[model samples]
Target: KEPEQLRKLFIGGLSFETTDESLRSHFEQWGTLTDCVVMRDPNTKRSRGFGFVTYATVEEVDAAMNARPHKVDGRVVEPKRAVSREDSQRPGAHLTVKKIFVGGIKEDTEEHHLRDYFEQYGKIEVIEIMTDRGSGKKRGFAFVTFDDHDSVDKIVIQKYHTVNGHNCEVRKALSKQEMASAS
Candidate 1:
């Protein structure tokens, strides 16, 4: 018999209140779950705010990918394929340039303003304004990708970059694989 191929998914940005049962229920629609876990602090028994979900087949995993950005316990969570510790530790993997995370964005700030603010560094390729999946409101964070990778350096070096009087956090954007490892 052919061995069933299982895949693991890394779910990040989970709310502290999320529990294993809730996490499984939230993801159960996407596939036949082989295993599900919500990492928790042993001392306090509070969720560490992330976990792994394993599917019995690749088709199930693919379905889950399309089912994001998932919400668990009233928070939008980032979900991606889990990477192995060995693969993550390998030198120079999943590297990228030219993208930066923009956080603390004012709710009413438009994409044009975002482009205007970031244009000083270089030409922008794309500006992604993250919004709440349920409410359809701004998520107070965005991602800006530039035509030139060097622009990321210029933006990060600045101590302050605000939008509409609100201070925004800026940093190099990480790949899905990197995001999984970092959490």
Candidate 2:
């Protein structure tokens, strides 16, 4: 097993009401921990319903995962090893928060293409295609914020969103939180 994967964790299905200390509270029962943080959007001050937890040793990671019912704030969460990813693509843990993260976008993808596709789910409140601040180029990902929270659930029903027949990745856009350096 990779030593890197043993020390870190990907905590999915978190409750939006759950907090950083609460997550740490739930996991620390296994043993001592190194770091923990719930991913959140600072602008809105909302929880992204997913987070990372790191432990002092590999055994702690095992004990935490093996333990049944990782519940916090009346919600049962899914805990697993934090796998190493090549691209900056995120782990999915959306909780009807009205924001959708689209990834693997093509350079030629247009704003209309995204709006046209996502509008079917709900009234779009915001669509931000990430671009390099200095270079001025698409970052192969975007955020689609819907008017209704349930719209996110409808759109994410399909794992990948295909724009112009091009398959792309979609995840809950959890922005601006300094996640703990676990992976």
Candidate 3:
């Protein structure tokens, strides 16, 4: 389920819900469902508030989509969900690098906006865009590296941010093995 993301779609905008059949009822209209789950708090067993939907390669939702653009009911989702639940759910694995990761940036967002907006957090050392330049396309995200690691804490406490109208999630950078592996 973690491999080959083009077959998967991250279902967002859910506010604590998802019955398997109900999800199938909505998505099966597009194609036969392969994998679907609404995760809960492991200890408490409450909704984690969002779900991830991945379809089978059967006709692949390729023929099913017909380029109609899935569902407009929720915010247009990113093609991939890169975070691992345990690693992301709690930031317990501390390491080096005084960087803050930013996600949910709008396609049109530029580096200057990130620099100026995040400058309020602390003394930024540099701004890094996930998007490659020249032939590289925008990934619609960025990261801010500040001199002090504590700057990340200041940003996280505020939680969500509005970057040129689109809201984003900000958190401490992944500096361990998993981080390098993904890169």
Candidate 4:
């Protein structure tokens, strides 16, 4: 959702063993919980290793964000404002260059390695490796934008890939296109 309306946080790095009750109890300490979900496979009904938590107010969202190194089921979880198509369509939206979210990075991965690996796909406009505020270490994910918009399509079609021996997730962030369509 849009930054202003954000009361939901996308939580990642969940252990497959995490349960719905466990998620609620841990996050409920911050504020009144409106909703909480652990994504699960359709057939196997197994945890998808991630989940979403919705709080009652923006303050709660802020509280959750500032509290670093959230651990659930023995894994450090990363929480960020959940963005959706509707968020992009909010008024006063601006055009954004082609961007992709890169997740599952190794702790030892460097910014240069990311640039070198993704540069082959297209001209990179920006590579933001989200870092830990406390230790200034890579947060195991990043946002990489390209000068060539078509590179988004090309990179996404590939099968599983890795950087620094860690399999990573790459997906297009179509906020710009979403805004254009909404307008």
Candidate 5:
């Protein structure tokens, strides 16, 4: 089954006796849980007394927290939650100087062509044409980052569906820092 909203929940202060089945039984009240396996000691195979719970999505996790199910082994489970995407301490969101989206692109559209076409807008910092990892073919979408944020806003609202035989949509790409480094 598809993951339900894909949220990573921090479940702390759990009773060491709690089992994986017990955890699943308690979380089922919120929504469909894709996986509820509680990490255990390798040698002892016993509950670590705490583990992370991954909900399908961030929204589902929020719902679970709001539901506040206190029925696990007769002990209250208080899961302090935050969107797995959030750093919590990060500052405001800025869209300026970000990447824009260009869709309906030919399955063979190259990054240089995309950059050249959008150059009329302003200086492009980078051009990325997303392709399927498995098939190694264009995903019919590309991202272009301009030298400045004003350029991003100008292009995003102006472009509509298709451009140059490709459906063109525009938005800022996720910041480079947002990319996972742990991998």
Candidate 6:
């Protein structure tokens, strides 16, 4: 993998005195935590006041949002996506936006070819060819977007549904608040 796999997120704002057991217990409700590791200082071996959680399934990782304001050692722990392996290593490695559904693809394109075509759309935030977990091949449905919303809209309106052999759907990836407001 030229680009390293992005998995394992770091969680912060944990109580200074929190332990692996306590953190694990709190996050247990979210899903099966393969392991909950609290980074401790090398000198004192005291907690760094942060931790990382490894969810057994990607579904569990997404489910954490709903279970927010989670209490840990009488304090609310703030869970966030961590980048480095030194942070957290768990499932859901390829959950990034760019790696999933790719737009602006020409019909009859393969994974490598799709990357070459869509790379020009913008900064190439993420280029993922969704693969069947079992077979590890392109799933045909991939996602791509620009760092700039304007660029996204430009592609959406100009290219829109005309890309590839099928009609591509373009829309905003809404936030939770946006989803609520629309309702």
Question: Which candidate number maximizes lDDT?
Answer: 1
Report the lDDT tens digits of candidate 2 across residue range 1-183: 335545887788899888889989988999887889899998987989999999888777767766856887789987755645532244444343689888888888888989878898779998888899999987888888988654675455445678856988776566465233223
Off by over 4 Å in 1: 1-6, 91-183
Model 4 stretches with alpha carbons more than 4 Å out: 1-5, 86-183
Per model, how many backbone clashes are there?
0, 0, 0, 0, 11, 10
List candidate 3 segments past 4 Å from native: 1-89, 92-96, 132-134, 180-183
Clashing pairs for model 6 are 8-88, 9-82, 10-82, 99-128, 100-143, 101-142, 101-143, 102-142, 102-143, 107-164
- Measured on C-alpha atoms, candidate 6 has an lDDT of 0.57
Task: For residues 28-94, write the lDDT of model 1, one tens digit per residue.
Answer: 9998888889998899888888898888886787688766668888999977556455544643322
N/CA/C clash count, model 2: 0
lDDT of 3 by residue, 1-183 (tens): 324344544455444445555556666777656777666789998866556566765244444434334443343422223234444556532333478789888888888878767887678898888877776888877888998654564455454787876679887777667567656
Each candidate structure's TM-score, on Cα atoms with residue i matched to residue i, is 0.48, 0.47, 0.45, 0.47, 0.40, 0.45
Greater lDDT among 4 and 5 belongs to 4
Please tell me which predicted candidate would have the highest TM-score against the true structure: 1
Candidate numbers, best lDDT first, in rank order? 1, 2, 4, 5, 3, 6
Worst 10 residues of 1 by lDDT: 87-96
RMSD of each: 15.7, 13.0, 14.8, 16.4, 13.9, 14.7
Kindly list the per-residue Cα lDDT of model 5 for residues 38-129, writing each as its tens digit: 67889989887675666766566657765755546776655643223343333322333467767668776777677656887678887778
